UniProtKB/Swiss-Prot annotation:
Protein name, per record: Cell invasion protein SipD
Any single GO CC term annotated in Swiss-Prot or TrEMBL for this entry: extracellular region
Swiss-Prot/TrEMBL induction comment: Transcriptionally regulated by SicA and InvF. Also regulated by InvE.
Lineage: Bacteria, Pseudomonadati, Pseudomonadota, Gammaproteobacteria, Enterobacterales
Organism, scientific name: Salmonella typhimurium (strain LT2 / SGSC1412 / ATCC 700720)
Part of the full-length chain shown: 132 to 328 of 343
Swiss-Prot/TrEMBL keywords: Coiled coil, Secreted, Virulence
Subcellular location: Secreted
Annotated coiled-coil segments of the chain: 165-192
Similarity comment: family membership: Belongs to the invasin protein D family.
């Protein structure tokens, strides 16, 4: 027999497998998270109406701002649906050492805002600064009319909307970054196995 080699192979696999595990969790939580933000983007057209003579437009800042806040509050929590690291499972929250967190914080290339503390330890959550920034700007447009909607001229509208898609893109970028990284992690696991099975 070749008991040491087996031992070696099993050990390396576990390391690469372990690594791939975290990422599978990261990718899930984020693609899922973004899905929820897409369901909002679809409704986007249903909250827009031209002024009267396309000289202005009426935007349902309320409905929008409320769905954004709902999403931000849902993912502002801590559970198997909002934490990227460590993987959450079952009863009570699972926490990591600040160092362990900060490490992943750097690995996933995420901002410090993504680092949250829970009792004895820490956890890494999705980046909400974008959504929050969105909601801030929507409030920056001014108070709505008695119909809770805000009629604004095209200059203002398309200005806001540029800034809105700037934030929409930030989140788009993160979800990519994390998928590329997950793809590498996964490639790596498969390569390790070939190198060890042969």
């Amino acid at each position: 027999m070749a008991e040491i080699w087996d031992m070696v192979s099993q050990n390396i696999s576990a390391i690469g497998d372990s690594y791939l595990g975290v990422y599978e969790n990261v990718v899930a939580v984020y693609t899922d998270f973004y899905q929820a933000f897409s369901d909002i983007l679809s409704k986007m057209g249903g909250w827009l109406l031209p002024g009267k003579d396309g000289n202005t437009v009426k935007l349902d800042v309320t409905s929008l701002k409320n769905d954004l806040n709902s999403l931000v509050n849902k993912y502002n929590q801590i559970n198997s649906n909002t934490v990227l690291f460590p993987a959450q499972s079952g009863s009570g929250v699972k926490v990591a050492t600040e160092a362990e967190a900060r490490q992943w914080l750097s690995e996933l290339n995420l901002p410090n805002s993504c680092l949250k503390s829970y009792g004895s330890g820490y956890v890494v959550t999705v980046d909400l600064t974008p959504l929050q920034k969105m909601v801030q700007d929507i409030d920056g447009l001014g108070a709505p009319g008695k119909d809770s909607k805000l009629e604004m001229d095209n200059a203002k509208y398309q200005a806001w909307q540029s800034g809105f898609k700037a934030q929409e893109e930030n989140m788009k970028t993160t979800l990519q970054t994390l998928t590329q990284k997950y793809s590498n992690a996964n490639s790596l696991y498969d390569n390790l196995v070939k190198v060890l099975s042969s």
